[PDB]
Amino acid sequence: ANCTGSFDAISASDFVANINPGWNLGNSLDATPNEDSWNNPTVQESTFDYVKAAGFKSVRLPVTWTHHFTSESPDWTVDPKWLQRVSDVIDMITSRGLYTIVNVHHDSWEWADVTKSDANITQIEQKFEKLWYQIGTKLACKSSMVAFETINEPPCNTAEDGAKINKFNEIFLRAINRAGGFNAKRVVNLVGGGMDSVKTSQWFKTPANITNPWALQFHFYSPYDFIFSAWGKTIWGSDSDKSELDSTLGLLRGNFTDVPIVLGAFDASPTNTEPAARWKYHDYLIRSTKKYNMSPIIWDNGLDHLDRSSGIWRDPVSIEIITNGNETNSLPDSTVDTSAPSQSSSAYIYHKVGTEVTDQTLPFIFNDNTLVSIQDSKGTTLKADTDYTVSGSNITFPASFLSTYYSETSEPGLLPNFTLKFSSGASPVVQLVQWDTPTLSKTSAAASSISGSDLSIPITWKGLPKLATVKALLNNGTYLVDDFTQWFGPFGEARTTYSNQWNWDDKNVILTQATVEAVVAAGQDTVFTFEFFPRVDTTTNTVNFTLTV
Numbered sequence: 336a337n338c339t340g341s342f343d344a345i346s347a348s349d350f351v352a353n354i355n356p357g358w359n360l361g362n363s364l365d366a367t368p369n370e371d372s373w374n375n376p377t378v379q380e381s382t383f384d385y386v387k388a389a390g391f392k393s394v395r396l397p398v399t400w401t402h403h404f405t406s407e408s409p410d411w412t413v414d415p416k417w418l419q420r421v422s423d424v425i426d427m428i429t430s431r432g433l434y435t436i437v438n439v440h441h442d443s444w445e446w447a448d449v450t451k452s453d454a455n456i457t458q459i460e461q462k463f464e465k466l467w468y469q470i471g472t473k474l475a476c477k478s479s480m481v482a483f484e485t486i487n488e489p490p491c492n493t494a495e496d497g498a499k500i501n502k503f504n505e506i507f508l509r510a511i512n513r514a515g516g517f518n519a520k521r522v523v524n525l526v527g528g529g530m531d532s533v534k535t536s537q538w539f540k541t542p543a544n545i546t547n548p549w550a551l552q553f554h555f556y557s558p559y560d561f562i563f564s565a566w567g568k569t570i571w572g573s574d575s576d577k578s579e580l581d582s583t584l585g586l587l588r589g590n591f592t593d594v595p596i597v598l599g600a601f602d603a604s605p606t607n608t609e610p611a612a613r614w615k616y617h618d619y620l621i622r623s624t625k626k627y628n629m630s631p632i633i634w635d636n637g638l639d640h641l642d643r644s645s646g647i648w649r650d651p652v653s654i655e656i657i658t659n660g661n662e663t664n665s666l667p668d669s670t671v672d673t674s675a676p677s678q679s680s681s682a683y684i685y686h687k688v689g690t691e692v693t694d695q696t697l698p699f700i701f702n703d704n705t706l707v708s709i710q711d712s713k714g715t716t717l718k719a720d721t722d723y724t725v726s727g728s729n730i731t732f733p734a735s736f737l738s739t740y741y742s743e744t745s746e747p748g749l750l751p752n753f754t755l756k757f758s759s760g761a762s763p764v765v766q767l768v769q770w771d772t773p774t775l776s777k778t779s780a781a782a783s784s785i786s787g788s789d790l791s792i793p794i795t796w797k798g799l800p801k802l803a804t805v806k807a808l809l810n811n812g813t814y815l816v817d818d819f820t821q822w823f824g825p826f827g828e829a830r831t832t833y834s835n836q837w838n839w840d841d842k843n844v845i846l847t848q849a850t851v852e853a854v855v856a857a858g859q860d861t862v863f864t865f866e867f868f869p870r871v872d873t874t875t876n877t878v879n880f881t882l883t884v
């Protein structure tokens with residue numbers, strides 16, 4: 336096309352500096368078929384005001400094109416209303432000063448999967464080229480604040496697959512350059528297989544004769560077990576944990592020693608991850624992206640962090656951690672030894688119904704900050720050395736004080752929380768929880784009687800309305816799934832995995848239809864143990880439920 340404005344060209348190194356840090360508009364234009372098709376409503380522009388006001392500098396804009404094609408071979412014409420909607424949203428972002436990265440997203444596995452046995456790699460490459468030519472035509476006159484990203488986490492298993500991903504980068508660069516406008520000088524993000532650090536390192540090969548300023552983008556979702564709540568992993572922050580994280584990132588940077596690198600998506604989601612672990616994890620990831628000079632962009636599906644209807648960040652602590660790579664954060668300590676028979680977290684004051692109200696000492700990692708003040712969610716400010724003292728790295732709360740919030744007999748549930756202001760960094764939040772062992776509506780069922788769908792089991796939450804994990808054992812001792820978890824310690828063995836096997840909502844614990852299929856195929860009554868926070872042992876704060884067959 337023929338452009339009218341000015342385009343203030345910017346180097347890839349400068350673009351990557353200036354986006355630090357970003358936020359993903361997840362589950363919006365990448366949702367299928369349409370933008371309101373999943374959990375998010377139609378995209379509204381106040382969202383980017385919230386994002387800017389939080390300290391983000393850029394918005395990553397995932398877009399799924401799959402269901403907006405009006406023609407197939409040979410032209411693969413994109414719905415011109417979809418092209419205009421994407422252009423409109425980019426205008427919403429850049430007009431507020433936020434940099435944008437727009438991509439091709441869930442198309443990666445919906446039609447552009449090179450690893451799937453019956454893929455017309457010919458056809459995939461044409462459609463991809465036609466797609467990015469039409470994208471690149473519509474956006475050709477966008478300013479230098481808008482970058483293009485080749486394709487999201489493309490499936491890639493072997494080195495021959497990885498060579499195909501390299502072609503994707505080349506096809507992309509050719510199409511957007513044929514499109515014209517300012518595209519020849521637009522910052523682009525090239526990708527490796529799965530946007531995985533090791534696959535990018537193993538198989539990425541820079542497009543020959545590349546003329547665009549470019550940067551590398553990868554996604555980080557490790558360690559799998561803590562990030563995806565697999566096999567009962569609810570702690571994070573040990574020497575080996577931090578080492579596994581720093582090594583993974585360092586191996587990527589060592590292989591791309593002078594390349595601008597964008598960490599395009601990462602998240603320990605507040606939905607499923609314990610808060611003290613999650614804050615330790617985000618703090619450390621931020622510490623490492625500073626070390627290895629990578630620009631982070633947090634993944635947010637709309638339920639993870641910002642509530643676009645209210646502007647409340649569900650987890651303001653992570654956002655503080657991520658929006659300031661130039662600050663030291665004081666964090667609550669927590670168990671990190673997976674062989675410990677009890678798990679504690681200073682993100683909570685816990686009190687069990689029916690037990691006496693005691694003093695609570697919360698060990699914290701101060702990191703040479705000082706505690707300035709504490710304010711409860713009712714607006715009352717606690718009196719230092721009266722409602723709390725600080726001994727070493729321990730913050731201690733007197734029983735007389737805490738009993739003004741809960742008693743031996745008050746109802747379970749979330750009481751107010753305490754916000755700790757420090758010398759510097761984020762303000763962590765300690766959540767008072769009055770807890771009791773939950774109770775389940777049913778204690779067993781026939782597999783036949785509950786098939787046709789998932790198993791939703793009504794529950795009386797008593798404290799935290801969160802499922803920590805679910806243990807699963809056939810009547811004869813064998814693990815229902817994943818026998819290797821027998822090396823995972825007291826809180827790991829025979830446990831199963833969030834979303835794949837279990838879930839929960841405001842009123843139920845859920846075993847997925849997949850899990851009830853495992854019980855059928857095992858031909859045995861198997862016992863599920865639902866587990867809740869606090870994880871004070873492996874039995875007390877748990878409820879049992881067996882599945883007959």
Ligand SMILES: OC[C@H]1O[C@@H](O[C@H]2[C@@H](OC[C@H]3O[C@@H](O[C@H]4[C@H](O)[C@@H](O)[C@H](O[C@H]5[C@H](O)[C@@H](O)[C@@H](O)O[C@@H]5CO[C@H]5OC[C@@H](O)[C@H](O)[C@H]5O)O[C@@H]4CO[C@H]4OC[C@@H](O)[C@H](O)[C@H]4O[C@@H]4O[C@H](CO)[C@H](O)[C@H](O)[C@H]4O)[C@H](O)[C@@H](O)[C@@H]3O[C@@H]3O[C@H](CO)[C@@H](O)[C@H](O)[C@H]3O)OC[C@@H](O)[C@@H]2O)[C@H](O)[C@@H](O)[C@H]1O
Nearest residue numbers: 362372373374441487488600602604606634636638639834
């Ligand atoms: O918060 C996590 C939690 O969400 C719970 O879902 C409730 C909520 O979901 C809405 C729709 O979710 C889609 O799944 C999305 C997911 O929400 C999203 O976060 C995820 O992000 C990816 C991203 O795309 C990647 O590029 C990269 O960034 O990794 C992200 C993953 O991040 C994970 O770890 C960090 C956390 O921050 C994240 O929350 C966590 O998810 O993308 C998925 C999309 O999944 C597809 O793309 C990635 C690919 O690898 C997957 O294999 C692929 O999955 C396929 O998706 C198909 C699409 O339709 C299909 O489901 C296939 O079966 C599946 O294999 C769901 O895909 C979509 O169905 C949800 O929309 C609702 O669906 C219900 C019924 O299905 C409808 O009734 C309703 O109208 C829709 O809104 O909002 C609605 C609520 O009902 C959900 O419960 C979820 O239950 C829970 O398990 C967690 O995932």
Ligand SMILES: *[C@@H]1O[C@H](CO)[C@@H](O[C@@H]2O[C@H](CO)[C@@H](O[C@@H]3O[C@H](CO)[C@@H](O)[C@H](O[C@H]4O[C@H](CO)[C@@H](O)[C@H](O)[C@@H]4O[C@H]4O[C@H](CO)[C@@H](O)[C@H](O)[C@@H]4O[C@H]4O[C@H](CO)[C@@H](O)[C@H](O)[C@@H]4O)[C@@H]3O)[C@H](O)[C@H]2NC(C)=O)[C@H](O)[C@H]1NC(C)=O
Nearest residue numbers: 374375376637638642643644645647648649712752764766
């Ligand atoms: C310390 O304590 C304080 C108080 O004691 C805590 O404050 C509480 O913080 C909560 C979250 O931080 C906050 O909840 C939110 O309140 C707002 C304002 O009224 C409300 O809109 C929010 O509801 C959304 O979020 C919840 C998840 O928390 C969703 O389950 C809910 O459905 C809402 O999400 C829907 O709308 C979003 C915006 O559009 C969508 O993105 C989302 O996908 C979902 O969409 C569905 O419904 C839509 C219609 O709503 C529909 O369009 C769509 O298609 C989907 O079907 C949320 O409740 C509390 O308000 C706040 N409490 C108080 C008293 O202030 C604080 O967090 C504590 N701090 C810590 C660290 O623990």
Ligand SMILES: *[C@@H]1O[C@H](CO)[C@@H](O[C@@H]2O[C@H](CO)[C@@H](O[C@@H]3O[C@H](CO[C@H]4O[C@H](CO)[C@@H](O)[C@H](O[C@H]5O[C@H](CO)[C@@H](O)[C@H](O)[C@@H]5O)[C@@H]4O)[C@@H](O)[C@H](O)[C@@H]3O)[C@H](O)[C@H]2NC(C)=O)[C@H](O)[C@H]1NC(C)=O
Nearest residue numbers: 532533534535536537582583585586587588589590591592
């Ligand atoms: C760039 O990134 C890569 C990938 O992340 C980094 O390489 C990995 O580094 C880790 C730790 O340094 C290695 O882990 C150890 O590997 C030992 C040997 O692994 C062999 O088996 C692999 C599987 O087939 C094979 O790929 C690998 O080939 C490599 O080494 C050969 C001999 O040293 C050499 O012939 C090849 O050219 C190739 O470089 C090995 O034969 C294993 O025994 C240990 O137990 C441990 O797990 C990974 O294996 C490495 N993966 C690779 C190389 O694919 C690399 O460090 C990064 N570079 C920088 C500068 O940071």
Ligand SMILES: OC[C@H]1O[C@@H](O[C@H]2[C@@H](OC[C@H]3O[C@@H](O)[C@H](O)[C@@H](O)[C@@H]3O)OC[C@@H](O)[C@@H]2O)[C@H](O)[C@@H](O)[C@H]1O
Nearest residue numbers: 444488489490491492528529530531532554555556
């Ligand atoms: O599932 C699609 C694609 O994912 C790549 O995995 C990458 C990715 O992880 C994100 C992705 O992980 C899947 O396992 C989950 O099912 C999905 O919900 C989640 O969004 O980014 C970081 C990498 O560590 C990871 O390998 C695969 O590599 C790719 O082959 C393909 O399978």
Ligand SMILES: *[C@@H]1O[C@H](CO)[C@@H](O)[C@H](O)[C@H]1NC(C)=O
Nearest residue numbers: 809810811812813857858859
């Ligand atoms: C329990 O039954 C399963 C069903 O196949 C079997 O595989 C397993 O061997 C049995 N348990 C033991 C300890 O052998």
Ligand SMILES: *[C@@H]1O[C@H](CO)[C@@H](O)[C@H](O)[C@H]1NC(C)=O
Nearest residue numbers: 862864874875876877878879
């Ligand atoms: C659950 O069942 C196991 C044995 O099947 C038992 O050891 C454990 O104490 C039970 N716990 C609860 C809370 O029912």
Ligand SMILES: *[C@H]1O[C@H](CO)[C@@H](O)[C@H](O)[C@@H]1O
Nearest residue numbers: 677678679680696698871
């Ligand atoms: C874990 O450990 C803490 C102290 O570090 C206790 O307060 C808690 O009850 C649990 O045993």
